[PDB]
Amino acid sequence: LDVARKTLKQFVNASYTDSYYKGQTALHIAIERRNMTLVTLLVENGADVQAAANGDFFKKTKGRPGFYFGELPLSLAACTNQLAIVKFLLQNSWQPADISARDSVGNTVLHALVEVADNTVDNTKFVTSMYNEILILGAKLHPTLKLEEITNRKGLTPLALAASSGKIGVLAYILQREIHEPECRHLSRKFTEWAYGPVHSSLYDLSCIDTCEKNSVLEVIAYSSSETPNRHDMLLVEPLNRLLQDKWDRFVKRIFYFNFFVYCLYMIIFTAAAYYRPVEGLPPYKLKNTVGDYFRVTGEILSVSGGVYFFFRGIQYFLQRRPSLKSLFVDSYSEILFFVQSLFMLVSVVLYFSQRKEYVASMVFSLAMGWTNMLYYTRGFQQMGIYAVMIEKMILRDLCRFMFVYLVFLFGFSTAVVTLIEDGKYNSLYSTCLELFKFTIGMGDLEFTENYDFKAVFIILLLAYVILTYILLLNMLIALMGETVNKIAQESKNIWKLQRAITILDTEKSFRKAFRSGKLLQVGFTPDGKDDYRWCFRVDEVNWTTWNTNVGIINEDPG
């Protein structure tokens, strides 16, 4: 009070010039301390409500300390759970705040609210409540403004930003938003088409969900990086699972089955062609004038064609999705496996026309990978798909740890044994390593050689190796697999659902039939008189407890 002199502005609006706190003003400080009266005092004297706190401390993450809130006093009040200050700043008689203002990175107040969400119960409650209040106030102040389709510099809406960042609570709130007040019901995304007795039909807005031309929620979630916090859990949010199942059952399951059948035919033809390979001399092999010879050459042409097709599919995937070199070998296992199989096939072709018999080695590697790649198609069936996911998880955790320890023990005991051996057929590291590995598969000899002195040392080494590996480590592997199986049921089901979602999106892009649902009139009209049509997904619900069902039904005459 005693320092504001009308000798006023440029002093009640002075701001930090420090690069760390650049842009911070007294209004920011007053809001941060949660002082309503002080904020009113600063607003009265002409303090700017559009001041931007652009300092590094207020940047997203660059520099370990700092709090990001959107740089604006309105966003600061919103992201600190101060509803009264937000309302005052929006509807003050001196300088109203611009609800549509975008910060340095293009984020509005809704974007900042999504950015400060962290998927915790109290945080989620406060963030979604503030989001709803801001939406309602914006509708009241600017009935025509379209707040939730304003994008930031990255071209993301608050919904797209939430989906691409794993803010699952915000996403769930947005997708099921039901605003039950007149003149603002158009902001809602979930509607009730009709209610009769205990059963009521719900309509889910699908705009920006399965087709957006910039980034749909489904595309954003399905193709998110492995680091995204909740990527496997976001497809469980209410409408998305039913929408994916609807796409599956309507058109994708049949195409997937046809693809599986074609792959089975390809593998059968490849196996038959490889089985009847000539064993005469060096390739290429002259074509005999026989029916079997012509069929074999046809099979070989078809096998090479499939290899070329999968090589180009792998190239296309690498170009279209551009893996970040970490999701390459941590995600996209099936793409890599099919591409490697195709590479073995093409190397086999090259060796075959170079007159090298190693083409057979390359070809059998391709054949084995082609058969094991059949496990990809277990996705498409719930039980087998979840089983395949569990197989992947077992390989990646339990088998890997076991194999490291086991190979250390095997190599150590093999080097000790081969050193002890004086001469003969087992005086090589390879032979003794193979003999010791036979113990792991129930075939160990325990007397496979006598070419030594100190038989006691030989038997002691073999017994120690047996006790440590066969009796301890293998049975421990079984126990650890049991623990893993106990702990990963829900994770495996969610991963399978994400895999099927990826398949569905891929089919929809490589198959205007694939179109979600019906176009329906759902809120009547906008704040303007015009009636608004939205693509909506219908879900039937039954509730015997809350009989009231007091709703703003769209259609009477249910059904």
Ligand X SMILES: CCCCCCCC[C@@H](Br)[C@@H](Br)CCCCCCCC(=O)O[C@@H](COC(=O)CCCCCCC[C@@H](Br)[C@@H](Br)CCCCCCCC)COP(=O)(O)O[C@@H]1[C@H](O)[C@H](O)[C@@H](O)[C@H](O)[C@H]1O
Which of 181/227 has CB closer to ligand X? Answer: 227
- The C-alpha atoms of residue 546 and residue 495 are separated, in whole angstroms, by 35
Which of 145/408 has CB closer to ligand X? Answer: 408
Judged by CB under 8 A, the chain residues 332 through 371 that form the site for its own copies are 357-358, 360-361, 363-365, 367-368, 370-371
293 is in an annotated binding site: no
Which of the choices Na ion, ligand X, its own copies, none does residue 361 contact, using the CB cut-off of 5 to 8 A by kind?
A: its own copies
User: Closest Cα partner for 500 from 367, 340, 336, 378?
Assistant: 378
Which of 330/346 has CB closer to its own copies? Answer: 330
Which of 21/333 has CB closer to ligand X? Answer: 333
Which of 141/265 has CB closer to its own copies? Answer: 265
Closest contact distance (angstroms) between CB of 503 and ligand X is: 9
- The C-alpha atoms of residue 432 and residue 391 are separated, in whole angstroms, by 31
User: Closest Cα partner for 190 from 239, 149, 233, 132?
Assistant: 239
* CB neighbourhood size of 157 (10 A): 24
- The C-alpha atoms of residue 103 and residue 153 are separated, in whole angstroms, by 10
Judged by CB under 5 A, the chain residues 493 through 532 that form the site for Na ion are none
Binding site for ligand X (CB under 6 A): 226, 331-334, 337, 365, 368-369, 372-373, 375-376, 389, 392, 395, 460, 464, 468, 495, 498-499, 502
Which of 188/499 has CB closer to ligand X? Answer: 499
Contacts of 35 (CB under 8 A, 6+ apart): none
Bridge pairing between strands 190-196 and 199-205: antiparallel
75 is in an annotated binding site: no
Closest contact distance (angstroms) between CB of 162 and its own copies is: 17
Which of the choices Na ion, ligand X, its own copies, none does residue 417 contact, using the CB cut-off of 5 to 8 A by kind?
A: its own copies
Which of 432/499 has CB closer to ligand X? Answer: 499
Judged by CB under 8 A, the chain residues 184 through 203 that form the site for its own copies are 185-186, 188, 191-203
- The C-alpha atoms of residue 411 and residue 429 are separated, in whole angstroms, by 9
Which of 40/80 has CB closer to its own copies? Answer: 80
Our finding on whether 242 is near its own copies (CB under 8 A) is: yes
Which of the choices ligand X, Na ion, its own copies, none does residue 271 contact, using the CB cut-off of 5 to 8 A by kind?
A: its own copies
Which of the choices its own copies, Na ion, ligand X, none does residue 540 contact, using the CB cut-off of 5 to 8 A by kind?
A: its own copies
Which of the choices Na ion, its own copies, ligand X, none does residue 333 contact, using the CB cut-off of 5 to 8 A by kind?
A: ligand X
Q: Rounded to 5 degrees, what are φ and ψ at 514?
A: -80, 60
Cβ pair 193, 142 in contact under 8 A: no
DSSP assignment of 111-179 equals: HHHHHH--S-HHHHHHHHHHHHHHHHHHHHH-TT--GGG---TTS--HHHHHHHHT-HHHHHHHHT---
Which of 3/544 has CB closer to its own copies? Answer: 544
AA identity, residue 235:
L
Closest contact distance (angstroms) between CB of 403 and its own copies is: 8
21 is in an annotated binding site: yes
Determine which residue in the list 395, 425, 450, 511 makes contact with its own copies, applying CB under 8 A: 395
Which of 86/163 has CB closer to ligand X? Answer: 163
334 is in an annotated binding site: yes
Our finding on whether 434 is near its own copies (CB under 8 A) is: yes
What is the pattern of x (binds its own copies, CB under 8 A) and - over residues 131-160? ------------------------------
Sheet holding 199-205, edge to edge: 190-196, 199-205, 531-542, 518-525
Our finding on whether 327 is near its own copies (CB under 8 A) is: yes
> Looking at 136-144, 165-173, 347-355, 469-477, which segment touches its own copies (CB under 8 A)?
469-477
Cβ pair 444, 436 in contact under 8 A: yes
* Cis check: omega of the bond before 284, within 30 degrees of 0: yes
AA identity, residue 67:
F
Our finding on whether 130 is near its own copies (CB under 8 A) is: no
Find how far residue 380's CA is from the centre of its chain. 18
22 is in an annotated binding site: yes
Which of 267/369 has CB closer to ligand X? Answer: 369
**Three-state secondary structure string covering 59-96:** CCCCCCCCCCCCCCHHHHHHHCCCHHHHHHHHCCCCCC
Determine which residue in the list 153, 278, 476, 511 makes contact with its own copies, applying CB under 8 A: 476
- The C-alpha atoms of residue 307 and residue 370 are separated, in whole angstroms, by 10
- 70-89 burial, b at 16+ Cβ within 10 Å, e below that, comes to bbbbbbbbbbbbbeebbebb
Chain breaks in the chain (C to N over 2.5 A) after: 7, 511
5 is in an annotated binding site: no
Determine which residue in the list 145, 445, 450, 511 makes contact with its own copies, applying CB under 8 A: 445
321 is in an annotated binding site: no
Judged by CB under 5 A, the chain residues 407 through 446 that form the site for Na ion are 442
Judged by CB under 8 A, the chain residues 263 through 282 that form the site for its own copies are 271, 274-275, 277, 279
Residue 440, token pair as written in the block:
């792991």
- 305-341 burial, b at 16+ Cβ within 10 Å, e below that, comes to ebbeebbeebeebeeeeebeeebeeebbebbbbbbbb
- The C-alpha atoms of residue 306 and residue 312 are separated, in whole angstroms, by 10
User: Closest Cα partner for 540 from 205, 172, 203, 235?
Assistant: 203
Closest contact distance (angstroms) between CB of 331 and its own copies is: 5
23 is in an annotated binding site: yes
- The C-alpha atoms of residue 49 and residue 72 are separated, in whole angstroms, by 8
Q: Which residues does residue 519 pair with via DSSP β-bridges, in sequence order?
A: 535
Judged by CB under 8 A, the chain residues 3 through 62 that form the site for its own copies are 20-21, 32, 34, 57
Closest contact distance (angstroms) between CB of 352 and its own copies is: 14
Residues belonging to the binding site are 21-24, 32-33, 333-334, 372, 379, 442, 445
Residues belonging to the binding site for resiniferatoxin are 333-334, 372, 379
Interface positions with Na ion (CB under 5 A): 442
Residues belonging to the binding site for Ca(2+) are 445
